[PDB]
DNA sequence: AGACGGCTGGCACGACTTTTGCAATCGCAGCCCT
């Protein structure tokens, strides 16, 4: 499929549900921490999915503000719209039979939310008048780093709305978790920054920098691990010199 | 007897008017161009 960051047994296995998954055209959920991508997975897997070909929406959440599924999901395409009439796309009607993945979905308010769950409870929200009924064919996706399971035990959004907007919630596990794609990371950062920062090599991590990733807490993960990059690129040292002190923390003051 | 008067209107600038000067996207689908 594509390139990819991490084999481990974990993500081996989060490979296998993926296949599993892309049958289900069934709305589910693939959990993790920001910073990794897991939806280039999701896109990976769709190419793999029900849409080997087909249609693909990014829909970051917080892109949309004051501006209903009508205004940019639905659109506008037809005559008599608001103003002067002509035609206008839009998204959740354009994109039907290929993949809808919404981003950073946790990042919701209660009035998107209600919407969004007369669209799953009905297969779209529709539009203009009650009579009119909507449904869509993309495969739906979503995804966040927030564990709803608080936030609806607060009740930033409806539960059982909660429970229909998926089939099957799943959970990245952390990376620092792993800890031992740390070194397939790290190689692989190396060649493609060799390749990007035209070093004349890798300097590899030298026995520090492993030890201090070896203790390292990594709290962002994919994303401290992309942070260890450039950190490292900071660190650089030389292309023979075995990066031991390879991590850069900007918080940090040096001397 | 040359200067006032008041007429006159030209000279000018803002305030009410006011004609005109603007036509389309839909709707399939079929027929025509490829
Ligand atoms: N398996 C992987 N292979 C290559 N790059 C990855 C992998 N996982 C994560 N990444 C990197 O992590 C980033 C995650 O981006 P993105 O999915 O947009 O995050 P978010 O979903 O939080 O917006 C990508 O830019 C990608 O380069
Ligand atoms: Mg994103």
């Known amino acids: 499929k594509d390139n990819l960051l991490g084999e481990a047994n974990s993500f081996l296995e989060v490979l296998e549900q993926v296949s599993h998954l892309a049958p289900l055209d069934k709305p589910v959920l693939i959990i993790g921490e920001r910073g990794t991508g897991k939806e280039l997975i999701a896109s990976r897997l769709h190419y793999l999915s029900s849409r ?3 249609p693909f ?20 395409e037809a005559g008599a719209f608001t103003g002067a009439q002509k035609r206008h796309p839009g998204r959740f009607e354009r994109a039907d039979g290929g ?25 779209e929200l529709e539009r203009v008048g009650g009579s009119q009924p909507l449904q869509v064919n993309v495969r739906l996706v979503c995804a966040t780093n927030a564990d709803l399971p608080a936030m609806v035990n607060e009740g930033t959004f409806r539960a059982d709305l909660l429970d229909r907007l998926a089939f099957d919630v799943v959970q990245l596990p952390p990376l620092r978790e792993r800890e031992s794609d740390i070194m397939l990371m790290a190689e692989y950062f190396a060649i ?8 004349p090599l890798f300097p590899g991590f030298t026995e520090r920098a492993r030890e201090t990733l070896l203790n390292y807490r990594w709290p962002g993960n994919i994303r401290e691990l992309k942070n260890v990059v450039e950190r490292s690129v900071y660190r650089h040292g030389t292309s ?8 850069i923390d900007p918080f940090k003051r040096r001397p």
């Open 52 to 54: 080997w070909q087909g």
């Open 57 to 76: 929406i990014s829909l970051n959440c917080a892109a949309l503000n004051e501006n209903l599924l009508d205004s940019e999901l639905f659109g506008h």
């Open 99 to 123: 993949t809808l993945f919404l981003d950073e979905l946790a990042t919701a308010p209660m009035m998107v939310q209600e919407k969004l769950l007369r669209v799953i409870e009905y297969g």
């Open 192 to 199: 493609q920054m060799c390749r990007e920062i035209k070093l």
């Open 240 to 247: 023979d010199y075995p990066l031991d002190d390879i991590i």
